Amino acid sequence: DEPKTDKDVKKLGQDDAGYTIGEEFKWFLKSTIPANLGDYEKFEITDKFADGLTYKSVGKIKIGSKTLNRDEHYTIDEPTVDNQNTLKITFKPEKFKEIAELLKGMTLVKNQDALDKATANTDDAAFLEIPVASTINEKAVLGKAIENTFELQYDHTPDKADNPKPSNPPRKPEVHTGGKRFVKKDSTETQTLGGAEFDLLASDGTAVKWTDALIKANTNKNYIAGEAVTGQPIKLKSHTDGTFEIKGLAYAVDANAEGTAVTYKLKETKAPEGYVIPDKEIEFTVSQTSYNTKPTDITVDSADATPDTIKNNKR
Ligand SMILES: [Ca+2]
Ligand SMILES: [Ca+2]
């Protein structure tokens, strides 16, 4: 009857997701609920978040359809620099009976596999669900899985002895973000061309906008056309050596860190002096290896992937 635990990302049942830096998403810390929860003398969850994740908030803690209330049923200690980005959630031992009473008409999820596979949390199949809002920040390595887990310390014995045991997710969820490098050249890929300007767009043509975290991930001002401001469209520029890049775009959106690449596009709004503005957007893809060749082998970007050459035609 003792707790089994699991962690998900994006939505219940999902273990892998890809994000653009600064986009807020949820982790889900999950536990089965013991039938004898009323007896428990400790129920405390600790989550040390990787450096490349920024904690945002804790959502509504749910068991089946019902919500537990902050500072009434549990207490939160938030991630800070001082505690090495660590979240703690402490369920109040003196509320263990009250919480158990809330569970009365619910059918409880029992075993690990069912917890792992759950895509919903309902009265008919209930468990403890802790959504934690998070972003991937500028400290991420492009193409590198960022894992998360937690540990539950539970005391199931109502014996007045402080003797908790651990419960740990057997398998860990992860997120990832990517990038791309470019070089602007003439029509035969000979001369490098400075001063081209591009709007960064999603594949459907929606402009990608700055957020403060994404701004912090794109610190080389030579590659940015004008000022970067949160909420405004991303505009890139080729440097005097023809080069530019974009760092922190989603790929493998619903897959592991090796998963499906995502297409983005560039609208050339200004051509190098003497050259023509094209009608058609230039596409590129972001993948695990489109910025770093070997992201599993590093803790900071190498930026060694082969840039895409973008051609320009003469006036
Ligand atoms: Ca999971
Ligand atoms: Ca005990």
Side-chain angles (χ1 to χ4, degrees), residues 1-314:
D1 196 33
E2 296 167 37
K4 277 59 187 149
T5 49
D6 178 41
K7 194 176 183 174
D8 295 345
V9 67
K10 188 163 182 173
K11 63 178 197 187
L12 292 172
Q14 183 155 166
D15 288 320
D16 297 280
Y19 294 103
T20 293
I21 288 178
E23 180 176 316
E24 191 177 299
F25 62 87
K26 301 291 172 37
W27 302 92
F28 296 88
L29 292 26
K30 310 151 70 191
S31 181
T32 60
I33 309 285
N36 68 319
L37 180 69
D39 289 341
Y40 277 51
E41 294 180 336
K42 193 180 164 84
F43 201 99
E44 182 195 359
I45 280 166
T46 304
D47 193 323
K48 181 181 176 172
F49 287 99
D51 176 62
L53 299 173
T54 292
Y55 164 89
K56 294 294 174 178
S57 55
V58 181
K60 290 177 69 166
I61 296 185
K62 305 286 280 226
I63 307 171
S65 62
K66 289 185 192 204
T67 295
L68 298 183
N69 303 307
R70 186 168 170 186
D71 288 328
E72 179 179 16
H73 308 288
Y74 63 90
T75 66
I76 292 168
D77 182 41
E78 295 154 18
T80 59
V81 173
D82 287 354
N83 63 28
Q84 324 310 131
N85 217 19
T86 301
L87 169 67
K88 200 194 299 168
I89 301 165
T90 305
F91 294 81
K92 302 194 174 174
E94 73 270 21
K95 292 293 189 187
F96 294 163
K97 298 284 208 51
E98 185 173 300
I99 302 172
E101 198 73 2
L102 297 179
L103 319 158
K104 281 167 92 194
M106 300 188 198
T107 297
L108 305 178
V109 175
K110 289 293 168 228
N111 299 328
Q112 184 78 61
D113 191 56
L115 183 65
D116 288 349
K117 287 192 196 348
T119 65
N121 182 6
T122 68
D123 289 354
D124 289 324
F127 62 90
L128 180 65
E129 177 190 348
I130 305 173
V132 180
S134 187
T135 65
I136 303 177
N137 64 49
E138 70 279 2
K139 304 181 286 179
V141 168
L142 306 188
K144 196 181 176 68
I146 302 165
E147 293 187 301
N148 184 58
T149 194
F150 65 97
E151 177 175 278
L152 167 62
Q153 282 287 329
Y154 68 91
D155 182 338
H156 71 101
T157 58
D159 59 1
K160 279 61 190 182
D162 188 8
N163 45 14
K165 299 172 65 184
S167 177
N168 301 271
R171 291 156 279 283
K172 299 178 192 189
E174 61 79 30
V175 297
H176 31 87
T177 195
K180 188 70 186 179
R181 319 181 53 231
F182 304 95
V183 56
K184 191 58 176 77
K185 297 186 180 185
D186 58 8
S187 64
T188 67
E189 306 181 319
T190 311
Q191 305 288 311
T192 55
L193 303 175
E197 296 180 2
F198 307 87
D199 288 352
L200 170 69
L201 311 176
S203 183
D204 70 6
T206 305
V208 188
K209 294 176 182 315
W210 292 111
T211 54
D212 188 69
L214 197 55
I215 288 175
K216 294 204 202 310
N218 291 269
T219 56
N220 191 338
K221 309 217 171 178
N222 296 331
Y223 303 157
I224 308 302
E227 294 308 322
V229 301
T230 296
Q232 295 302 124
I234 296 185
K235 304 176 169 278
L236 303 172
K237 190 191 83 211
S238 61
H239 181 45
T240 62
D241 56 12
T243 68
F244 61 107
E245 358 179 290
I246 184 60
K247 299 185 76 176
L249 296 181
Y251 76 98
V253 171
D254 297 300
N256 68 22
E258 279 184 34
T260 311
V262 165
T263 300
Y264 292 84
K265 47 188 196 195
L266 300 173
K267 184 201 174 175
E268 196 169 345
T269 60
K270 183 190 164 299
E273 178 73 73
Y275 294 78
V276 161
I277 291 157
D279 293 310
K280 291 177 70 77
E281 291 90 358
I282 307 109
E283 301 189 336
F284 66 92
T285 54
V286 179
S287 69
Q288 176 171 56
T289 59
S290 58
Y291 192 86
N292 302 131
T293 56
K294 288 291 179 186
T296 57
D297 296 344
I298 69 187
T299 57
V300 58
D301 287 331
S302 48
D304 60 328
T306 299
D308 281 4
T309 292
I310 299 167
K311 295 175 157 176
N312 283 268
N313 296 300
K314 271 193 82 49

